[PDB]
């Protein structure tokens, strides 16, 4: 029911981040993945970030197929959370799950405090 619960996060943790911080689907999809770790099609199934990234890419393709099936203008990007998916799993593959997850938690404590009390340094 929650995609991130087993990876150690939740949808609310990724909701804390500003929506403009995440890259688009083009750079997160076309760049990043398929550039780094070019061949993941090996019949292996390593750490589940891979097997979630698979159904994530195939899922976004089965989405874009239905979106381009229409062609009274300007469809919606509200149905796009897959930047959170791809950025999460890809960042967890490149930097490790523990690093990006600790970034999600530490940033979760950046917001949730009154801005007048905030420390001089923002999470990275």
């Amino acid at each position, epitope marked *: 029911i929650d995609p991130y619960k087993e990876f150690g*996060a939740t949808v609310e943790l990724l909701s804390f981040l500003p929506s403009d911080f995440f890259p688009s689907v083009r750079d997160l999809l076309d760049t990043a993945a398929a550039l780094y770790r070019d061949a993941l099609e090996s019949p292996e199934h390593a750490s589940p970030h891979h097997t979630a990234l698979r159904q994530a890419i195939l899922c976004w393709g089965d989405l874009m197929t239905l979106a381009t099936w229409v062609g009274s203008y300007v469809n919606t990007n509200v149905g796009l959370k897959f930047r959170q998916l791809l950025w999460f799993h890809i960042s967890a593959l490149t930097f490790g799950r523990e690093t990006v997850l*600790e970034y999600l938690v*530490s940033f979760g404590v950046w917001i949730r405090t009154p801005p007048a*009390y905030r420390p001089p*340094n923002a999470p990275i």
Partner: antibody
Amino acid sequence: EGRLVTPGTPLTLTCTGSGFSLSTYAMIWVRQAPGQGVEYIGIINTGGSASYASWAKGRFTISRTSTTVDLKITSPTTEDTATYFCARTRGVNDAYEHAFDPWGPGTLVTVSS
Amino acid sequence: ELVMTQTPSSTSAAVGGTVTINCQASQSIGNALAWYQQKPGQPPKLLISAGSNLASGVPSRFRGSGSGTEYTLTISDVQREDAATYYCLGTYSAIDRAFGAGTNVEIER
């Protein structure tokens, strides 16, 4: 490993820990009564901003310098006798951090006549 | 004000057996919870950061989990060296923090 102070006399515990050239960790303090659990006292940010817990507000004051981080107990009562630990964040962090692996050995403070 | 209610207090387990401690938060900290291990005459040894990061060479039998206001530290393989008191904190903000009452874990023998 221990410090004795008569009731009412303010004291200051100085904290370095593992410190060699550790200038910004946004360090925290904790006290533990004998046979009882740990209690959170407060933090001091990298800018010298000291945040306290509600119960410890006004009883303690957390200072710091470039080379040291200090905790002053003002008018210590008999209820304040306990072991005091100081713990620093791991890495960049600085006051947004939820967990600190490095810990000082602790100093046992006894308030008695 | 944030307060962490911690469960069983004293608990017992046998070598190879399992023991589960759970930490309940009065306010959702978003996996800001952390698990610490402490033995008498020693400062606390950090077990886990966030939900799952058991850091710096901690035996993999310590497994944290939970989200929102509900968290758990599970010791799967119980060893005689694991008898000790475990504490959970959690941090709401950079201001408010609180410690649990602690859980005393004894090895059955």
